[PDB]
Symmetry: C2
Subunit: 79 residues, 2 copies
C-alpha cells in the first residue's frame, strides 16, 4: 500500500488548480464526487504529450488538451 501524485490546472479566467494524490492502497466506491467536470478532465486520454519536466529521480510528463470548451494541463509521473 502506497502513493504517488500529479497536478491538474486549467487555462482561461475562472481557472481551477488541482493537486491530486493517488493512493494504490467488492461493494462500494471510496467517498463523494467533487465537481464532476474535474473528473472528466483528469481521466480523458490526452494522447498528445508535449512536455517532460521535473528532476529525476522524479519525472513528470506535461500534456495540454481541450475538453468541450476549456483548455487544461496535466503533469503525471512517468519513470
Amino acid at each position: 500500500e502506497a502513493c504517488v501524485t500529479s497536478w491538474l490546472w486549467s487555462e482561461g479566467e475562472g481557472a481551477v488548480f488541482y493537486r491530486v494524490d493517488l493512493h494504490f492502497t467488492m461493494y462500494n466506491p471510496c467517498g463523494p464526487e467533487p465537481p464532476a467536470h474535474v473528473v472528466r478532465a483528469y481521466n480523458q486520454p490526452a494522447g498528445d504529450v508535449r512536455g517532460v519536466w521535473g528532476k529525476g529521480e522524479r519525472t513528470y510528463a506535461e500534456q495540454d488538451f481541450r475538453v468541450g470548451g476549456t483548455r487544461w494541463h496535466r503533469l503525471l509521473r512517468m519513470p
Copy 2:
C-alpha cells in the same frame, strides 16, 4: 476535499490487479512509490478507447494498451 476511483489490471501470466483511489483533497510529495512500473502504466495516455461500461449514475471508460511488452487495461470515471 473528496474522492473518486478507477481500476487497473494487466494480461498474461504474472498479472497484477489494481484498485486505485484518487483523492482530490509547496514542498514534498505525499508518501512512497509502489512498483514504478505500475505508475508508468496508469499515467500513460492510452488515447485509444474501446469500452464504455458501468451503470450510470457512474460511467467508466475501458481502454487497453501495450507498454514495453505488457498489455494492460484501465477503466476510469467518465461523466
